[PDB]
């Protein structure tokens, strides 16, 4: 099958950065647009971005910028999203999400299960 | 960036009864006539599950009590019979353009 496997729950303080894992297995993640979807505590899905992870090329909504990078690393089929100077706007779930032709051609059908980062002292 | 509203914000049915809610997209999200909106169902504590895409096409596994109609920018789900396993956020996204966004939801609630 299809899966995204995304690295555990973190609780980290103010002004740390947190870098989180997304591991797909059952498709190659060069051939998909790696999304990432933020979800604050009673909150909406807000997309964040995406990676290309055939060329490293990534996209971010402005508001983003400076506070999230995607990343890829093809040799062990894994996309990355690092957040930094974390605050507690910050505090949310983080989700994956692949978006390409031959995996996931129409929408998002295949969704990680959420990585969620806690910001407080 | 397409802003959809969902409505209403929550929905109480009945085992058994119709539920509907609306998404709204203040401008058009069709692609040569399709709609590029999606609608997913988010059970407590999981993450997002597919249930249509392109407005009103089912992905496998779906129930045929789910369905979607709309283009432009106003689109339906319709769950008949509504089944305890549908206790759930529900959200539109359009894919139209990016930046991808997403409707606020509608929680359904069963008394």
């Known amino acids: 099958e299809v899966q995204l496997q995304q690295s555990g729950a973190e609780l980290v303080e103010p002004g740390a950065s947190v870098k989180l894992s997304c591991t797909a297995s059952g498709f190659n993640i060069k051939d998909t647009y790696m999304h990432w979807v933020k979800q604050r505590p009673e909150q909406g899905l807000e997309w964040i971005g995406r990676?290309?992870?055939?060329?490293?090329?990534?996209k971010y909504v402005p508001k983003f910028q400076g506070k999230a990078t995607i990343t890829a690393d093809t040799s062990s089929n894994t996309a990355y999203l690092q957040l930094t100077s974390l605050t507690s706007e910050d505090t949310a779930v983080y989700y994956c999400?692949?978006?390409?032709?031959?995996?996931?051609?129409?929408?998002?059908?295949?969704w990680g299960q959420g990585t969620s980062v806690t910001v407080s002292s | 960036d397409i802003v959809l509203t969902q409505s209403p914000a929550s929905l109480a049915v009945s085992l058994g009864q119709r539920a509907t809610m609306s998404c709204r997209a203040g401008?058009?999200?069709?692609?040569?006539?399709?709609?590029?909106l999606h609608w997913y169902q988010q059970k407590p504590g999981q993450p997002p599950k597919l249930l249509i895409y392109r407005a009103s096409n089912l992905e496998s596994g779906i129930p045929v009590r789910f369905s979607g109609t709309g283009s432009r920018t106003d689109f339906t789900l319709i769950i008949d019979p509504v089944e305890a396993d549908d206790v759930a956020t529900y959200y539109c996204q359009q894919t139209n353009e990016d930046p991808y966004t997403f409707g606020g939801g509608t929680k359904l609630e069963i008394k």
């Open positions: 401008e058009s999200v069709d692609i040569f006539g399709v709609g590029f």
């Open positions: 999400a692949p978006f390409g032709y031959y995996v996931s051609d129409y929408a998002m059908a295949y």
């Open positions: 990676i290309d992870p055939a060329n490293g090329n990534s």
